[PDB]
UniProtKB/Swiss-Prot annotation, chain A:
One record GO biological process: photosynthetic electron transport in photosystem II
The keyword GTP-binding appears for this protein: no
Name this protein carries in UniProt: Reaction center protein L chain
UniProt gene name: pufL
InterPro entries in alphabetical order: Photo_II_D1/D2_sf (IPR036854), Photo_RC_L (IPR005871), Photo_RC_L/M (IPR000484), Photo_RC_L/M_CS (IPR055265)
Source species of the chain: Cereibacter sphaeroides (Rhodobacter sphaeroides)
Segments on the Periplasmic side according to the record's topology features: 52-78, 135-166, 247-266
GO cellular component, one term: plasma membrane-derived chromatophore membrane
Subcellular location, principal: membrane
UniProt keyword terms in alphabetical order: Bacteriochlorophyll, Chlorophyll, Chromophore, Electron transport, Iron, Magnesium, Membrane, Metal-binding, Photosynthesis, Reaction center, Transmembrane, Transmembrane helix, Transport
Binding site for Fe cation: 186, 226
From Swiss-Prot, chain B:
One Pfam family in the UniProt entry: PRC
Function comment: The reaction center is a membrane-bound complex that mediates the initial photochemical event in the electron transfer process of photosynthesis.
Cytoplasmic compartment spans: 21-237
Keywords: Bacteriochlorophyll, Chlorophyll, Chromophore, Electron transport, Membrane, Photosynthesis, Reaction center, Transmembrane, Transmembrane helix, Transport
Cofactor detail note: Binds 4 bacteriochlorophylls per trimer.
Gene label: puhA
Disulfide bonds: none
Native organism: Cereibacter sphaeroides
Gene3D superfamilies listed in its UniProt record: Photosynthetic Reaction Center, subunit H, domain 2 (3.90.50.10), Photosynthetic reaction centre, H subunit, N-terminal domain (4.10.540.10)
Protein name, entry field: Reaction center protein H chain
Keyword Transferase set for record: no
Curated annotation (Swiss-Prot), chain C:
Protein encoded by which gene: pufM
UniProt cross-references to SUPFAM superfamilies, sorted A to Z: Bacterial photosystem II reaction centre, L and M subunits
Bilayer topology annotation: Multi-pass membrane protein
Designated name of the protein: Reaction center protein M chain
Major localization class: membrane
Family designation: Belongs to the reaction center PufL/M/PsbA/D family.
The entry's keywords: Bacteriochlorophyll, Chlorophyll, Chromophore, Electron transport, Iron, Magnesium, Membrane, Metal-binding, Photosynthesis, Reaction center, Transmembrane, Transmembrane helix, Transport
Domain of life: Bacteria
Assembly and binders: Reaction center is composed of four bacteriochlorophylls, two bacteriopheophytins, two ubiquinones, one iron, and three highly hydrophobic polypeptide chains (designated L, M, and H).
Length: 266, 237, 296
């Protein structure tokens, strides 16, 4: 196919020096930056699971400038290689997304993939900047260990009683969950149609629509589901972002006390 | 024990991935791929278990892994030297159908439906089809981008099944017509726009065959042109 | 993106080479509501043989729980709706084993209610079974379901049958099953060190993403009704072609209007398949996860 789609232009910035396809890859002055920002990352980084003496894909780790060290400062050993290494995602990512626009713009297609992940590069920042930045400290930012993270996670978590109580937390799960099968159904629907019984003729658009009104007795044909799906998803991640940004900062107490706001008065 | 669990699970996994999964991805997409890198740039699978389909009510048959190429005029040239290299369209691209523009060539048979309801008709042709909630593009003077307007709305060809406002007919000042896809266009109260597509042409809009029915190559041929606008229309950028 | 001029003709329907008898639930176009976003109709419906119970049953479960639900409150509104989360039916734990022959207030309800919901799921299972039939779809949701049932069938059935103790089942209340969770952590030895669990998270994220990827694509792919997935897995126009070009290019390598849902039916199902494995191990073939782990 393609051959016709490999067609000069779409360049956000680069003008030309960038309109090209390392094979399967469309370079452009973001892959080019995407690069410069991943290298310089794992370079400084890889420099760290050394300094650590030990390493083990598993237990090579990176922590920021631990609390009261401050928001300001920190040094390419207590701070930095974390510090810097961070400024390499909140930028390498942002950098790619854009690589995402650039592919789009030209590719003909539309706006939204690049927006959707823009959330992801948005979950993260929260945890490693916002949260941090608000608690006048980067310590609630976190490790960078295939395995600590549970830990960094597992504590702050429990830092506030059984964290599965922070409301918004409550929620995001339940999108997280729903946007699940929400795929368990969609991913199963399109299928059965496309791929039916033994000899029956390939099914119909309204072949589907017909199932659901029968299981469920509504049903959101074609389009309505790709939006809805990109819904419960995109959402729930985000409703995550709220969870926290809010957790270290206007709820200082164990979560279980929230809940009383209800259980008070008459 | 569970190491036998989690250790062989790691079979059901690698197992499926490059197996079934990616296997199927292949089924009927560059059932292998040439132009420079010959037989690949590494070590895929020599094309999976070829399977055949069942064309819907009306019959037909499609066998998926198939080598249906295209000597269907790619006005797509060369930029030089290596592959990955862009390839410039040999003149106003929007037409020759290349770049953003580029169509395809699905059948000269529109997607039927449940029955023969050729799925996508026009509002008149229709049964009891009107506007629950909305503004009505009809009589809605369609703008361009230019800002010199380029036509007057004449329908919204309705999708039966989804009951989908699929497209909106638009009659240029050659007392003529052409329909522009819905997910273009912005129905604002008093005015309309498939901004994508500067008025100051519009004409490009290929025609359909019979004025009741958008066949695949129609819709598809239609659908690009419009977009290429995105890519290839000066004002905008 | 999300409908900007709404239409809705007659009221539509289809064969079922089967017992259409069912039809109550009448076409009630919803507009502002399930219109703007999804679909304007609302029904028809098909309340078959099986579907009855599903409901019959599905309620008791709800009723029974709902019942001993009150008693804690002492038959009191203001009460009832206060500690509503807080209320809950806890099994014959009274830890005293896969030994039915229970009291109502200890075992009972639970052994009753809980065990009754055995049925809904079970039946309604069937449901997705034949609703396919009629229509003569495949049987994927029957597939894309026993997941939902695994971690079910387990979590509250299999396991606790393994420790010879319902004493082991999860309990009925809002803020209780939450609690009965981590409790479940602390005893299996901080459980993230659990291989299967992480996968189960491995994946339960795998989706978030992907529904957020498949979905968001098709949308940039309306411009050309990328949405029409069947009259596409038969016939490729830009739609496909390009909603795969993007990825071929971006992450180099792509999928196929089918495979993609082949990517989908799975991506999700593991998300449950997994945890089920996770969970019949995490009290037997593994008393602790640190340990097990540390010993690897
Ligand atoms: C024991 C601890 C507590 C608890 C404590 C916490 C804490 C503490 C936090 C959460 C958060 C989360 N918890 Mg909780 N949680 C508990 C129990 C649960 C249960 C459960 C079933 O019991 C569930 C389902 C959840 C659910 C979840 C999710 C809602 C949420 C994750 C946010 C998110 O995914 O953003 C996803 C964000 C991203 C993925 C970031 C972006 C990633 C990057 C940018 C993508 C590109 C990277 C790179 C380029 C990829 C390249 C790949 C290679 C090139 C190939 N928790 C227990 C009881 N939970 C988190 C949250 O709210 O965060 C907002 C959080 O901070
Ligand atoms: C698998 C790990 C734990 C568990 C841990 C949690 C955690 C962690 C969270 C919940 C929450 C919820 N759980 Mg639970 N939950 C479990 C087992 C169950 C089972 C069952 C197996 O029968 C059911 C029906 C429920 C039901 C529910 C809902 C009340 C709620 C979110 C609904 C949701 O999005 O569903 C999706 C389907 C529809 C929306 C339809 N859980 C298992 C035992 N559950 C959330 C909550 O806030 O509830 C108050 C929450 O954060
Ligand atoms: C707030 C929630 C926690 C979190 C909680 C968890 C949990 C809980 C688990 C993982 C595990 C994973 N995490 Mg995480 N993780 C967080 C943020 C990150 C970020 C980031 C760039 O922001 C990255 C790159 C990762 C990366 C990863 C992987 C190395 C591993 C496979 C993930 C996966 O399939 O996701 C989906 C996307 C693809 C499949 C593609 N985590 C935050 C800090 N992560 C698993 C792990 O710990 O190993 C068992 C695991 O069980
Ligand atoms: C703090 C407590 C513990 C912990 C305890 C547990 C426990 C305990 C269990 C899980 C499991 C899960 N955890 Mg954990 N988990 C923690 C930390 C985390 C964090 C985090 C740290 O980032 C994350 C992201 C996760 C993520 C996850 C999920 C991957 C996984 C199941 C969720 C799902 O998608 O399927 C959920 C699917 C269902 C609930 C299917 C239910 C199907 C039934 C049949 C449908 C019932 C409908 C009913 C009849 C009607 C009621 C309707 C409602 C009222 C709406 N956990 C901490 C470490 N987690 C499960 C697991 O994989 O274990 C192996 C589980 O059992
Ligand atoms: C937020 C909405 C959901 C979402 C969607 C989403 N993600 C996307 C898209 C979309 C819509 C893309 O188009 C884009 C992609 O092209 O994916 C295939 C992407 C993507 N989602 C990613 C990952 C990821 N997504 C996450 C979540 C989600 N993605 C959400 C649930 C998660 C978690 C855990 O939930 C993970 C692990 C990547 C696979 C990909 C884009 C990543 C990218 O930009 O990578 C470039 C690589 C480099 C620059 C090298 C890294 C250099 C760094 C400086 C060093 C590494 C440090 C970093 C901390 C690594 C992690 C450290 C430790 C925490 C491990
Ligand atoms: C693949 C993994 C995911 C999964 C899959 C899955 N679920 C499925 C399917 C599949 C593939 C279906 O085909 C099947 C389906 O038919 O429903 C969509 C279903 C389904 N998944 C369900 C629930 C469910 N699945 C869950 C989880 C999962 N399901 C995973 C996320 C969850 C959680 C824990 O998040 C829940 C709550 C049901 C909707 C449905 C099958 C339920 C079933 O067994 O029937 C139950 C019968 C009753 C409840 C009887 C009814 C009376 C009750 C007392 C209910 C009260 C309802 C209330 C009055 C409504 C109030 C709202 C109003 C204001 C509108
Ligand atoms: C093209 O693909 C696809 C379609 O297109 C044709 C579709 O339509 C759909 C349909 C998708 C949906 C209906 C969404 C899936 C779930 C949600 C969007 C949330 C909505 C959930 C429900 C409405 C809850 C289920 C309802 C139940 C369990 C009712 C049970 C009780 C009764 C029926 C009471 C009895 C009434 C008389 C999907 C999935 C799809 O993938
Ligand atoms: C219908 O629609 C759709 C399709 O249809 C065709 C699709 O296929 C897809 C694609 C979806 C799948 C294939 C499903 C499976 C995939 C997922 C579950 C995600 C799995 C993949 C990843 C986790 C990422 C894969 C690789 C990533 C993310 C980065 C890897 C990068 C490289 C290997 C090299 C990167 C090179 C770059 C960035 C630039 C190259 C260098 C330069 C630019 C600089 C040089 C000059 C100086 C989706 C989403 C879709 O929705
Ligand atoms: C294996 C046990 C799974 C139980 C997980 C939650 C099951 C009940 O969850 C909820 O449903 C009830 C309906 O009576 C509600 O009244 C309560 O909020 C709670 O019981
Ligand atoms: Fe789809």
């Amino acid at each position: 196919f393609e051959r016709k789609y490999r067609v000069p232009g779409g360049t956000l910035v680069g003008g030309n020096l960038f309109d090209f396809w390392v094979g399967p890859f469309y370079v452009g002055f973001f892959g080019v930056a995407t690069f410069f920002f991943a290298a310089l990352g794992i370079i400084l980084i890889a420099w760290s699971a050394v300094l650590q003496g030990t390493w083990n894909p598993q237990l090579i780790s990176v922590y920021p400038p631990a609390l009261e060290y401050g928001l300001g400062g920190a040094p390419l050993a207590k701070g930095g290689l974390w510090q810097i290494i961070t400024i390499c995602a909140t930028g390498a990512f942002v950098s790619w997304a854009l690589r995402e626009v650039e592919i789009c713009r030209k590719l003909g297609i539309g706006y939204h993939i690049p927006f959707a992940f823009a959330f992801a590069i948005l979950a993260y920042l929260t945890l490693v900047l916002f949260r941090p930045v608000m608690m006048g400290a980067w310590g609630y930012a976190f490790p960078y260990g295939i395995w600590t993270h549970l830990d960094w996670v597992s504590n702050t978590g429990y830092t506030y009683g059984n964290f599965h109580y922070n409301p918004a937390h409550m929620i995001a799960i339940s999108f997280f969950f729903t946007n699940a099968l929400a795929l368990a159904l969609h991913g199963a629907l399109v299928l059965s149609a496309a791929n039916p019984e033994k000899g029956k003729e390939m099914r119909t658009p309204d072949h589907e629509d017909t199932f659901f009104r029968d299981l469920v007795g509504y049903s959101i044909g074609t389009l309505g589901i790709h939006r809805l799906g990109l819904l419960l998803s995109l959402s729930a991640v985000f409703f995550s972002a709220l969870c926290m940004i809010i957790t270290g900062t206007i709820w200082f107490d164990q979560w279980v006390d929230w809940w009383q706001w209800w259980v008070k008065l008459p | 024990l569970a190491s036998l669990a989690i250790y062989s699970f790691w079979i059901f996994l690698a197992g499926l991935i490059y197996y079934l999964q990616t296997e199927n991805m292949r089924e009927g997409y560059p059932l292998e791929n040439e132009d420079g890198t010959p037989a690949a740039n590494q070590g895929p699978f020599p094309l999976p278990k070829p399977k055949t389909f069942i064309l819907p009510h009306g019959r037909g048959t499609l066998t998926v892994p198939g080598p249906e190429s295209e000597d269907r005029p790619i006005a797509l040239a060369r930029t030089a030297v290596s592959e990955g290299f862009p390839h410039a369209p040999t003149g106003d691209p929007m037409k020759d159908g290349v770049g953003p523009a580029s169509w395809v060539a699905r059948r000269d048979l529109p997607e039927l439906d449940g029955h023969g309801h050729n799925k996508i008709k026009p509002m008149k042709a229709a049964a009891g089809f009107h506007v629950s909630a909305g503004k009505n593009p009809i009589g809605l003077p369609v703008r361009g981008c230019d800002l010199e307007i380029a036509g007057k709305v004449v329908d919204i060809w309705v999708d039966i099944p989804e009951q989908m406002a699929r497209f909106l007919e638009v009659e240029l000042k050659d007392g003529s017509t052409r329909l522009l896809p819905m997910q273009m266009v912005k129905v604002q109260s008093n005015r309309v726009h498939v901004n994508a597509l500067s008025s100051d042409l519009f004409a490009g809009i290929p025609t359909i065959k019979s004025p009741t029915e958008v066949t695949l190559l129609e819709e598809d041929k239609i659908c690009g042109y419009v977009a290429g606008g995105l890519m290839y229309a000066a004002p905008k950028r | 993106i999300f409908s900007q001029v709404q239409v809705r003709g007659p009221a539509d329907l289809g064969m079922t080479e089967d017992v259409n008898l069912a039809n109550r639930s009448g076409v009630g176009p919803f507009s502002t509501l399930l219109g703007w976003f999804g679909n304007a109709q609302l029904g028809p419906i098909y309340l078959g043989s099986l579907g009855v119970l599903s409901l019959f049953s599905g309620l008791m479960w709800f009723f029974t729980i709902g019942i001993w639900f009150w008693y804690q409150a002492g038959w009191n509104p203001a009460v009832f709706l206060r500690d509503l989360f807080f209320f809950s039916l806890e099994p014959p734990a009274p830890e005293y084993g896969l030994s039915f022959a229970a009291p109502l207030k200890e075992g009972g309800l639970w052994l009753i209610a809980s065990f009754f919901m055995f049925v809904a799921v079970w039946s309604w299972w069937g449901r997705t079974y034949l609703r396919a039939q009629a229509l003569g779809m495949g049987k994927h949701t029957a597939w894309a379901f026993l997941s939902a049932i695994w971690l079910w069938m387990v979590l509250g059935f299999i396991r606790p049958i393994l420790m010879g103790s319902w004493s082991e089942a999860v309990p009925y209340g809002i803020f209780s099953h939450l609690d009965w969770t981590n409790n479940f952590s602390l005893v299996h030895g901080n459980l993230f060190y659990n291989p299967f669990h992480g996968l189960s998270i491995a994946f339960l994220y795998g989706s978030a993403l992907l529904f957020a990827m498949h979905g968001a694509t098709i949308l940039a792919v309306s411009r050309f009704g990328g949405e029409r997935e069947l009259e596409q897995i038969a016939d490729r126009g830009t739609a496909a072609e390009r909603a795969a070009l993007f990825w071929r290019w971006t992450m180099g390598f792509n999928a196929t209007m089918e495979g993609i849902h082949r990517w989908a039916i799975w991506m999700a199902v593991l998300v449950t398949l997994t945890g089920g494995i996770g969970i019949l191990l995490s009290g037997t073939v593994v008393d602790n996860w640190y340990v097990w782990g540390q010993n690897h």
